[PDB]
RNA sequence: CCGGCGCGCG
DNA sequence: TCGCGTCTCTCTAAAATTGCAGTCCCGCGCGCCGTAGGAC
DNA sequence: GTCCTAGGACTGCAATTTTAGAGAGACGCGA
């Protein structure tokens, strides 16, 4: 409703995305380090991308 | 309510009566924007 | 030299 | 002489369940049992 | 004896199964 062409989509889609990616990594993080799992961070964004 | 019926064909006279009823039953026999303005949404983007 | 059923090992 | 809610369906827009489709660690060993049915 | 012999568990999803929304042609009653 603020942008319309493509700024609207664009925008829109990078900054839910952007999030998603931040809180999903965290959440997986989150599970393995409560049993002491350790997994780089470069495996999860890996599967996240 | 049979003159709603006749919005459905061209209305040809009717009007008085039975002459509805005899047409009802004789229609069976024929069947300002800112679109392209980079300048603008980077306005609106801060 | 094919598949089912049962019992096991890591 | 028509007019009025309306009798009797009537046809479809919009959810509300509901019956499938899909899947459910890996790698080894051993044994048993099939292959059935019927008029001669 | 036998010789040929013919009933989990969870998710996903389209498919009913209504519920509903409006709605109209002919109408029995009525103005």
Known sequence: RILGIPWGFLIGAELTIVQSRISLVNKIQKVYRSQGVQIHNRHIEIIVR | ?46
């Open chain 2, 1 to 46: 309510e049979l003159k709603e019926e006749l919005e459905a064909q061209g209305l040809p006279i009717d009007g008085t009566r039975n002459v509805l009823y005899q047409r009802v039953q004789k229609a069976r026999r024929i069947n300002k924007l800112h679109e392209g303005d980079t300048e603008f949404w980077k306005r609106r983007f801060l």
